[PDB]
Amino acid sequence: TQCRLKLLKLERIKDYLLMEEEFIRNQEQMKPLEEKQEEERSKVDDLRGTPMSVGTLEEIIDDNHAIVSTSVGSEHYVSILSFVDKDLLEPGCSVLLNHKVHAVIGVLMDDTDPLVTVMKVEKAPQETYADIGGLDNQIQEIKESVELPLTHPEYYEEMGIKPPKGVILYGPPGTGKTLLAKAVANQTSATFLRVVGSELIQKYLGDGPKLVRELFRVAEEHAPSIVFIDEIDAIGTKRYDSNSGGEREIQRTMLELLNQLDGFDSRGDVKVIMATNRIETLDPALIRPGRIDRKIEFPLPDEKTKKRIFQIHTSRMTLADDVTLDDLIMAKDDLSGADIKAICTEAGLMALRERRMKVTNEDFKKSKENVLYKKQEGTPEGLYL
Amino acid sequence: QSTYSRQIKQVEDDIQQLLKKINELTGIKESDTGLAPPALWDLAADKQTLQSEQPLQVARCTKIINADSEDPKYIINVKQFAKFVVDLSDQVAPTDIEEGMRVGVDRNKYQIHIPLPPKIDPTVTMMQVEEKPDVTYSDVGGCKEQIEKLREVVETPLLHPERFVNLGIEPPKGVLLFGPPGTGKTLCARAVANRTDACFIPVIGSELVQKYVGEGARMVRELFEMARTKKACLIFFDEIDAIGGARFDDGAGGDNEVQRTMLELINQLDGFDPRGNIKVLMATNRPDTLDPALMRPGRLDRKIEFSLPDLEGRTHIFKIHARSMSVERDIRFELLARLCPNSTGAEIRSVCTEAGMFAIRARRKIATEKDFLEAVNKVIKSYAKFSATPRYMTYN
Amino acid sequence: DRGVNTFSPEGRLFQVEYAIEGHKLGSTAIGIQTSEGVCLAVEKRITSPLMEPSSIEKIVEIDAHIGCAMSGLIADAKTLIDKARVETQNHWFTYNETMTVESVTQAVSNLALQFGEEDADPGAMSRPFGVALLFGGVDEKGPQLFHMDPSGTFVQCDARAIGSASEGAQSSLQEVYHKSTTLKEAIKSSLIILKQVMEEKLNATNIELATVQPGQNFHMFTKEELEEVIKDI
Amino acid sequence: MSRRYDSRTTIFSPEGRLYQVEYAMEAIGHAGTCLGILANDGVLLAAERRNIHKLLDEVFFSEKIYKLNEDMACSVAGITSDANVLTNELRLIAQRYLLQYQEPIPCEQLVTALCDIKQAYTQFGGKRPFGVSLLYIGWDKHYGFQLYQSDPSGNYGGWKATCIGNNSAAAVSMLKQDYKEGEMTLKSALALAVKVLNKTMDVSKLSAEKVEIATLTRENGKTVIRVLKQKEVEQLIKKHEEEEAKAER
Amino acid sequence: VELPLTHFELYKQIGIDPPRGVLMYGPPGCGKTMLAKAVAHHTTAAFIRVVGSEFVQKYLGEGPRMVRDVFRLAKENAPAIIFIDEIDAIATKRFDAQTGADREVQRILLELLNQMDGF
Amino acid sequence: SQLDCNFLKVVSSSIVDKYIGESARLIREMFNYARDHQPCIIFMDEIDAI
């Protein structure tokens, strides 16, 4: 609190000085730039010809040509002349063409995919590491399997042969499978692409094998990388029609995965991380190793583990030092992560009704008896069963 | 940690905001990307603007029609999707303008300036073929009989068609690959491709079937034609249960999609002209789950056996996997191989690798015999169980 | 349901081919025929040190002179043994001679394939059995070991092993054993393959061994006599 | 074909339980409600008939509550159709046990025996389990006054006040709230019975035509089972007006 | 059908919570369309067969626009009735819309609904 | 055969188009054409898909 504060105040102030110093450089201070670069720009823009019509640079031919596809609608076989070199152009990028007669002027700009924008979500877990404790042994494993062959090459090189190519995170929700993928990805800072399994089965047919191959192929280009496939139970569970359920849809998606991961087309040291809450839906071929390598199983929380699982939920909320953990272990046990989330939410819910804007032991206790009953009730009790 | 997380959250927020302004503002600051060697090229570039032959428009020649009255007529499809008929190149050979060949034609005059390298006629077929690596026999377990037939059938007629003439048969049009999965079939397939110096083109059956059927038909035909241009090639169709599944068509299911794509492939197998020395290799679980209709046995030739490793058989794969790897061991390859039940090759291969991951856990950096012993017990249980559907009731 | 009349174009049932995979997850059984007896070895499957080997067995009596050790799916073995036990005792009153090891194996073999999706009765099934049984006993033709399998075929064998890997456990047994040999060497040969195919290793509460000599009754081994056979693995 | 359908009657479903058993409970919800209440010197059944019609002739005055025996009574909660078969099985069981026993039939004994038939169908025979939960009221010496509840699931329960049929969750609590363990006598209990029926119906307004009330009261040497005539129930409908005040107060 | 054409002043004056579209339903051949037409000859007012057949797709973004056109002409050309026989392909339950043609069918439905609130 | 007038024998496996509602509009154009050039009887063939 007070110990932190002097340094915090200083960091914000160091950053202020940094902002203010930029303004003086762009406006007044020049030495190599001068009036001279201003004129270089004018002279280059007029020769270059504004508007510049966008193209995409697929590949460069060394003889003073390039093969461009103009983005207007009809492609052109241009020359590489005027303010760029063959090597200065880079593949899969957006380039400037002279509008009057198309020769490729150059690459200032890069082209991002339309696909990647939607898929992508930023890397960082909202529950900090070493506070996703509780099955603490398990948390370590993912750091070893996906993160490590990319972070540290030393062990792998001495070990020899093929590295890992995935992990599968499975078992009851609430043991934090999403938080783990995000941690390793954060650390490496490998582009984290994220798609829910339900996107694999949508109304249009063959979208599933299509999305998954494009997603991977994009991961290889933007490599090293982490692909997260969140909650692949949907394949069978969902259908918009007869064609969208059933064997053709289920097979095509599974079949694509098999070729993509270790098969002919392969992948680099790009890892796929799969979250699944049921491996009942998943086959023995995607639970096969060497395209999954170590599988991580989370079991139901143990009596001692349950106290550590409860702490994580309590940390996101307000920090308890007045909750009796024994009462929770005594009342229910060998119930999911999801049950510990259920006790927490219900306490917050009763406090909300009063307009009490805290949770205390009292809110946890009052809600706790109804929640245990409620767990059993969630699955049918019928008339009187 | 509730009070501690807010402090940190605010401090980042402020520093992050300020950054937005600095980045935008600095930019590249009115510089030129080309630098000094392109200055001479600017002067050229201007001459070209005056010129009518620049810019060229890429197109493709769709069809050859003669009613010649100047110099040979060709109909090309422009990428604004207007058809135009153009004529023989200004100085280049007529033998460079062909059907399914790419050509550069003038934007302002529309006559063939220069022909270009061929193929861009399908959009989809170009997408369906993917990257090619090579892995060698060392890396793929076993020197067994099952391994040996793959080479003899694929490598020998394509490498030397001479041998196949001597016997008095043609080099296979078709070749069949069968064996249950998790045996390293794809791995073995990559390994023969390097030796033969026969290009392998990998293909996925899941791309072929699509919502409206017909795309997969044109794709398959175009795909055979491309391969036909290549000499001593293999079209390897991986993971197919479209061109690979059961023969049956429901008539309101995704089964329609399968049946069009299979049906063109039958036409291709025979060919418009035969396919002596061209191999298509197809992977199926076993030949009894493959069509009796797409399988018209004379053309397909040999069926190459691969089978699920035996207890002896897995003893053999495990020495290759271990030897390739860098490992320090005291315990032997046979013991651990007998330790495994009959299941798949894949569990037994993972042991060799898992012993290396236990070494990092153990706080070594290379494996030891105890890591090895630990790996068999966990691995046999893990991969085999906790998988597969819990129903085989009410399916077709 | 999905076809339970399912033939392949080769000319065998898919369902029978599926039946073996179940055996492979289950327990391990070794039967060896010796001139001087039949010894039967079976996995007890320890998993606590509280399970008592004398009180519970998986070497079970068909007759007071005949034993059967079971492998594969446990439920499935029990149904075959209860019909076989009565057939055997009824045989004893009538003939007044012990039942040949072959005679009992033939009866159980009828049950293995008779399945069909519909028209099922107790004599028929909805899916074929995935157990292989080693019926070992001493009769008047001498000590015999007959082997019955999931395909419902009976074969004479002087050594058969079936378990985690059926063919695997039989290949270890092919290397060691020789046809005509002493009781101790046959008992040794049964234990030795057993630990190597399994995940589990040899103990005296890990496995159960009982030996039938000719001129003896079926004896289930005492705590001490089970431990004596462990010294020679 | 028949091999390409599902209904998971004898076959277990992904649930671990059959569809047919769970569905039967839904049919029971939108059909007329039956409750049994305990009194100190008798037991009583009160039921809402399956007839929502405004005109009944009273051809059969058992259209919900049927008196099986001179020692027993039942109610129907569910479909009247599955009840018809069950009613005939009950007149035989109830009298058979009595021929032998010479003692008023135990409420528990009857239900467990019946529940066995309900479960027999769902498990085997390829028949669905009856869409009727039967509410048994009776008296035997070794438990005392009893009420037992029967399900299509083969579940039984020993109760002192319970209700099954429509809006059952509300109904059992409402019987608990007004009537604790051993609190209320037979006459005052008959009133309570109508009061819950007025509130809970498939279709509102409680009338003589819509209700049938049955008493088990032990008379001088015999246990007497009577279904009350429309006239008597009416005196209870005014009593039920008085009862609403009384619960609150 | 008849009352707002003949005398709208009466309609306005009562005060009501108006519905959007009005729905006629029964099994086919029950005379529902027949009758709406029958009244139209008796009233003496224009009729317009407005159906998915009238709507034309061949360029992307032409389909919803056509919906606006029909609505703007109807309001101009009072008294009139727009009658939709089958909204059986103007409105479908599936919109795949990864295809240009499929994407227009969804747009056509959206526009029908928004113009109809005003009408 | 007997009549010998203007005829539209309209195959309905070519009215159909990739876009939706272009095929409907098209059939309509044929009906208008038949009216101009009476007499006409319009034979609709293969209406198991139109």
Automatic annotation (TrEMBL), chain F:
Location(s), subcellular: Cytoplasm; Nucleus
Annotated coiled-coil segments of the chain: none
TM regions (residue ranges): none
Family, as annotated: Belongs to the AAA ATPase family.
Protein name stated in the entry: 26S proteasome regulatory subunit 10B
Organism: Rattus norvegicus
